[PDB]
Amino acid sequence: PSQNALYLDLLKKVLTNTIYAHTMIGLERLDNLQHCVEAVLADGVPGDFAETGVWRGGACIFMRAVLQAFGDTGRTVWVVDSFSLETVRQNFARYGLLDEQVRFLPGWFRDTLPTAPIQELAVLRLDGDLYESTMDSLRNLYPKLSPGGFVIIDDYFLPSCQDAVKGFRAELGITEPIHDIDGQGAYWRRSW
């Protein structure tokens, strides 16, 4: 049961500034994110959503929007970065989604992630340009990812991102198969 499809379709057009830019991830990667979120809602995987490396906040805005479209009032979207914080907050306000289901964690990943007030995740999304940001994010938040939760890495097929993600998976003995999105990003679903 796919609620408010027209709304999310239009929002993806708007976030990518194709109407006449709040995200640069493009439509295919927004599509991916939509399917992943609609899956954890439909399948009842518990947990919040979190993005580390958020740019103008678009992907997090969209995640909040899918919660809106499906009438889920319980889950939180965690917007995690070093920031322009007020600018991001105002981007949420523009779509009318700056509310209690959106939480901000500003700071160096070094300091914030270790102690993050997050208990469990259904979705974990990373814009993994850099080794240390990627490792800080995965090491601290993957353990919070519920069974059936998704991990999405936006820059996966960058060789250096790929090496870092592979190293992390080896460390923890993660073998859930990786899936390509668009030749740039990738994701996998934590086994049940």
The minimum distance between CB 80 and Mg ion, in angstroms, equals: 14
CA 47 to each of CA 38, 40, 73, 77, 128: distance values in angstroms, whole numbers, following the listed order: 13, 9, 12, 10, 22
69 or 128, CB closer to Mg ion?
128
Q: Is 127 annotated as a binding residue?
A: yes
User: Does residue 80 contact residue 52 with C-beta atoms inside 8 Å?
Assistant: yes
Q: Is 154 annotated as a binding residue?
A: yes
| Token couple for 124 | 């974990």
127 binds Mg ion (CB under 5 A): yes
Nearest to 178 by CA among 189, 163, 192: 189
Which residue in this structure is represented by tokens 């057009």? Answer: 13
70 or 109, CB closer to Mg ion?
109
Per CB under 5 A, contacts with Mg ion among 97-116 are none
The minimum distance between CB 127 and Mg ion, in angstroms, equals: 3
DSSP designation for 63 = H
Beta-bridge partner residues of 46: none
Residue 47: CB atoms within 10 Å: 21
| AA letter at 10 | L
81 binds Mg ion (CB under 5 A): no
Per CB under 5 A, contacts with Mg ion among 128-157 are 154-155
81 or 155, CB closer to Mg ion?
155
Q: Is 81 annotated as a binding residue?
A: yes
In the complex, which residues of this chain contact Mg ion (CB under 5 A)? 127, 154-155
Show binding-site residues for Mg(2+).
Answer: 127, 154-155
